[PDB]
Design a protein around this nucleic acid. Structure first.
Ligand SMILES: [Zn+2]
Length: 748
DNA sequence: TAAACCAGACCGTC
């Protein structure tokens, strides 16, 4: 016992199950001096916490933005990313106190964090710079003061859409003196949400043009493939990308781990959960600060329970905490603060800590399986690192085909560049909604460009629908309606369910939240809800009022459930037949039958019983485009057919979002071996947004191009048969590429 | 898989 971190690294270097060891070289801090033009008060205030020099990226950001060139920097929060935009903004306000700035954060909690840091930095100076947040949580009594006195206004894209722009006449103070627009995590604004936010930015730019100000955009993004391009397409201005990371970095060991095989005939490996529990045990017992990511909320709670039980003998009780989005605000702000100050030794988290919140800088990262994407893997890995010491990142794979392929071929992960962020701000639905909003704000002249080109046709269409009216050359708002209130930027999300502890009537308290869709299987009438190790049992799920009345409970087991998802075609309104192929387009419904739930003993993971789930069949009514394979009696084997359809669906999931310029989560591609109406093998592609937003329609239009791009992708990737980047490894035969390509050629 | 957001201002009433 009593080992150090280097001793633990050696014990992992040898005598282990490691399948790859990737060493990331240290980096000495590269710096430039504090600019002379910086206000003396700001230089003294930055002497606090030892910021007498600037990193190369911080200095480069300040210099680019001083000239007026908009920038996007790929700088982690640990490398001093907030200074890259706080320095120019605070400098500009210190020079001329009449200057203002908008900060755009993807969440309200991040806005609060940035306000707090800005308040500290400002208080260290002698200047009276007022910063405020203006979001749905801002009480309306203070909003009047905020519109007037706020030098720095910290908002959401959603609040900007819904509150600030449609009431620009109430914000004249900053729109006339706007110098900087900060966008904190650009990569979150991708896909359909990214399209909405791009149009919101267009409206903000026209508002700023009206008040005679052309602010400069300072953006931050994660390490995606196209940060400069996403920033340019999102803000509509040319961007200067800031690459170099002048922050100091130590040695980093990113290691691949494959759990041992427990039975050789049945060919079954040990759970990544158990190996992760024991690895984090050996690291936490030696007082090494560790983060553990897991793929789901239930598995996060499982790992918390196991780790705390097997570590409290040596470490104690109050050193390991959990983290997931369903936690209360106060509760997880406390968790973040504890991780930052260093008095929380370990944390078991979902992907929620991929967000650039300031939780300090961990020593060890343990991933329970591949996070899902290369970008997520690298961002999860960046949570472990030191200014000068060493750090480990253990990716413990599980039984997934993708995990096992990443294990058996580590060069496939280390050579692949991160994924790309694609938006299409010219989606007809989105562009029409935001054109109505923009016309409500300012009368929209016909020849003035909104983004790329002119858009007089949609203006004429809106005039025809009694919503706009042309006077001279400008289209005025001709409707009694407020458009911004009817348009949600992220209409995927709905109201959440609130978890209410009724354990005693005198201290009834709200303990957490959960999205409505997940509560069907996680909060049903007898489920067990695990809140950071605290056990509750759902007494009753008030589904219509989105409430879950629960009580405190101590049991041996936990609850899990899975949804039986079926898809039905309603009416087929478009179709195209070609030999052994027929591609239809129509309306479909996605039903989720809850069926049953399982009791699983927490300690042994054994099944100890089951139960029923009486909940309404949640259904999505949405447009879809499907292809079915017309076959002769000279058919193919059933299981071979399911494998082939699975491969085609993988290639479609790869190609469709790339060609239609959306995100992988914006469209769902499902496969059926025998559809209900036809009995033929069918692949459906449908956008999950309510009602639909033209993704399936564009897929039906360009499906021939999609199939050709799919064939090209299958032919050109350097794989032996299939990889997760093309058709997948689940195909068992030895001629996977050939069979899939034949089905594609037959699908002309 | 997880996670996230949403007029200003006045009127009518207790
Ligand atoms: Zn491949």
């Amino acid at each position: 016992k009593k080992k150090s971190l280097t001793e633990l690294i050696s014990d992992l270097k040898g005598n282990e199950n490691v399948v790859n060891w990737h060493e990331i070289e240290p980096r000495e801090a590269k710096t430039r001096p504090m600019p002379e033009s910086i206000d003396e008060r700001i230089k003294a205030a930055l002497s606090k916490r030892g910021i007498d020099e600037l990193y190369t990226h911080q200095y480069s950001a300040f210099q680019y933005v001083q000239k007026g060139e908009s920038i996007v920097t790929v700088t982690p929060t640990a490398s001093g990313k907030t200074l890259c935009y706080n320095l120019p903004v605070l400098q500009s306000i210190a020079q001329d106190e009449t200057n203002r700035a908008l900060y755009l954060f993807p969440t309200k909690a991040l806005a609060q964090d940035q306000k707090s840091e800005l308040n500290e930095i400002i208080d260290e100076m002698g200047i009276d710079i007022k910063s405020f947040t203006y979001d749905g949580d801002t009480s309306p009594a203070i909003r009047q003061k905020v519109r007037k006195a706020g030098h720095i206004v910290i908002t959401n894209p959603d609040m900007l859409h819904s509150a600030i722009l449609p009431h620009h006449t109430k914000w004249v103070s900053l729109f006339e003196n706007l110098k900087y627009i900060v966008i904190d995590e650009l990569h979150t604004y991708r896909g359909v949400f990214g399209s909405h936010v791009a149009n919101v930015i267009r409206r903000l730019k026209r508002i700023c043009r009206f008040y005679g100000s052309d602010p400069v955009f300072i953006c931050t993004s994660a390490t995606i493939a196209n940060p400069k391009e996403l920033g340019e397409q999102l803000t509509g201005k040319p961007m200067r990308l800031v690459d170099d990371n002048g922050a100091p970095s130590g040695r980093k060991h990113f290691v691949f781990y494959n759990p041992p095989i427990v039975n050789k005939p049945l060919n079954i490996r040990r759970s990544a959960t158990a190996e992760v529990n024991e690895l984090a045990k050996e690291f936490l017992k030696n007082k090494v600060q560790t983060i553990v990511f897991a793929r789901s909320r239930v598995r996060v709670e499982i790992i918390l329970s196991h780790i705390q039980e097997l570590v409290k003998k040596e470490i104690g009780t109050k050193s390991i905490r959990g983290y997931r989005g369903g936690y209360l605000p106060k509760e997880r702000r406390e968790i973040e603060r504890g991780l930052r100050e260093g008095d929380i030794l370990g944390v078991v988290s979902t992907n929620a800590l991929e967000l650039g919140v300031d939780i300090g800088q961990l020593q060890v990262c343990v991933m329970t399986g591949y996070p899902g994407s290369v970008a997520s893997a690298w961002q999860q890995a960046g949570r472990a690192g030191r200014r000068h010491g060493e750090s480990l990142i253990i990716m413990v794979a599980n039984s997934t085909p993708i995990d096992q392929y990443i294990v058996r071929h580590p060069e496939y992960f280390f050579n692949r560049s991160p994924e790309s962020a694609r938006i299409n701000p010219e989606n007809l639905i989105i562009l029409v909604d935001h054109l109505k909003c923009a016309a409500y704000e300012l009368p929209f002249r016909a020849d003035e460009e909104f983004g790329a080109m002119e858009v007089s046709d949609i203006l004429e269409y809106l005039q025809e629908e009694a919503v706009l009216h042309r006077n001279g050359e400008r289209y005025h708002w001709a409707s009694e309606s407020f458009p911004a209130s009817n348009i949600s930027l992220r209409s995927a999300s709905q109201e959440n369910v609130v978890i209410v502890d009724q354990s005693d009537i005198a201290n009834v308290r709200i303990i957490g939240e959960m999205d409505r869709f997940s509560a069907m299987t996680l909060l049903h009438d007898e489920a067990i809800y695990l809140h950071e190790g605290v056990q509750y049992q759902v007494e009753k799920l008030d589904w219509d009022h989105k409430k879950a009345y629960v009580r405190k409970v101590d049991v041996e087991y936990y609850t899990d459930a899975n949804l039986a998802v079926q898809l039905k075609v309603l009416e087929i309104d478009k179709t195209k037949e070609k030999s052994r192929t027929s591609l239809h387009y129509g309306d479909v419904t996605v039903n989720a039958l809850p069926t049953i739930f399982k009791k699983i003993k927490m300690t042994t993971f054994e099944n100890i019983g089951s139960g029923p789930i009486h909940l309404p069949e949640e259904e999505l009514h949405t447009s879809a485009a499907w292809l079915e394979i017309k076959t002769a009696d000279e058919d193919i084997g059933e299981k071979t057919l399911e494998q082939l359809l699975l491969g085609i669906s993988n290639v479609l999931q790869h190609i469709v979002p790339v060609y239609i310029m959306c995100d992988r989560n914006d469209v769902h591609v499902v496969s059926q071996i025998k559809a209900a109406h036809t009995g033929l093998p069918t692949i459906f592609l449908y956008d999950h947004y309510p009602g639909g937003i033209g993704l399936a329609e564009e897929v039906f239009k360009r499906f021939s191009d999609i199939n050709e791009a799919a064939k090209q992708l299958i032919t050109h990737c350097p794989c032996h048969d299939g990889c997760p980047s093309c058709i997948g490894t689940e195909i068992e035969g030895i001629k996977a590429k050939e069979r899939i390509l034949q089905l594609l050629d037959q699908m002309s």
